[PDB]
Design a protein around this ligand. Structure first.
Ligand SMILES: *[C@@H]1O[C@H](CO)[C@@H](O)[C@H](O)[C@H]1NC(C)=O
Ligand SMILES: *[C@@H]1O[C@H](CO)[C@@H](O)[C@H](O)[C@H]1NC(C)=O
Ligand SMILES: *[C@@H]1O[C@H](CO)[C@@H](O)[C@H](O)[C@H]1NC(C)=O
Lengths: 49, 49
């Protein structure tokens, strides 16, 4: 805090390093689905239905 | 002899005027994949065998 009007401010005498590892998920594998051949295989009787 | 899975264009009156069988060549195979007749250049994913 900005100091004025003098007071008993406590200050730290020593610090320590702290690593705070922080994972942020940012990619997923791009997909290219084909529902015509997922939902039904080489059978044609699906694909007209 | 057997089945065909041809692409069909159609004009303002609903009448067919252009077509391409899917087994005639290779380029019309992916014309039958993505329903576009004169397909622009680009990468086209997930074309099956
Ligand atoms: C500075 O002024 C404020 C208000 O007038 C007062 O409360 C404060 O005690 C003053 N500072 C000192 C060191 O007296
Ligand atoms: C404060 O941190 C320093 C640096 O790690 C360390 O040497 C000191 O022992 C710590 N103080 C206490 C009370 O743990
Ligand atoms: C079909 O496309 C052509 C090209 O723009 C257009 O002139 C025609 O009106 C379209 N047909 C209908 C029913 O909108």
């Amino acid at each position: 805090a900005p100091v004025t009007n003098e007071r008993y401010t406590e200050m730290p005498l020593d610090h320590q390093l702290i690593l705070t590892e922080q994972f942020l998920q940012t990619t997923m594998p791009k997909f290219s689905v084909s529902c015509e051949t997922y939902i039904c295989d080489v059978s044609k009787a699906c694909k007209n239905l | 002899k057997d089945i065909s899975t041809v692409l069909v264009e159609t004009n303002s009156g609903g009448s067919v005027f252009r077509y391409s069988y899917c087994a005639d060549g290779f380029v019309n195979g992916l014309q039958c994949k993505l329903r576009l007749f004169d397909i622009p250049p680009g990468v086209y994913s997930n074309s099956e065998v």
